[PDB]
Every structure is written in structure tokens, then in C-alpha cells.
Amino acid sequence: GIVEQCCTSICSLYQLENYCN
């Protein structure tokens, strides 16, 4: 669910960092 949370809404780097390894 990030393709929309970032493409449909906005995502903070912190939340975007939860997608790294």
C-alpha cells in the first residue's frame, strides 16, 4: 500500500524508510 499512499497521498521519509531493508 505505498504505491497509493505516496502516489495518491503524501508520505514522510520516516514512513518511506519503513520500506527499506
| Residue numbers at the binding site for other proteins (CB under 8 A) | 1-3, 6-13, 16-17, 19-21
For the bound state, the minimum distance from the C-beta of residue 18 to other proteins, rounded and expressed in Å, comes to: 10
Q: Cβ 12 to other proteins, closest distance in Å?
A: 7
d(CA 16, CA 10): 10
Are 3 and 20 spatial neighbours (Cβ–Cβ below 8 Å)? no
2: Cβ–Cβ under 8 A, 6 or more apart, which residues?
A: 11, 16, 19
Residue 19 Cβ vs other proteins, minimum distance, rounded to whole Å: 5
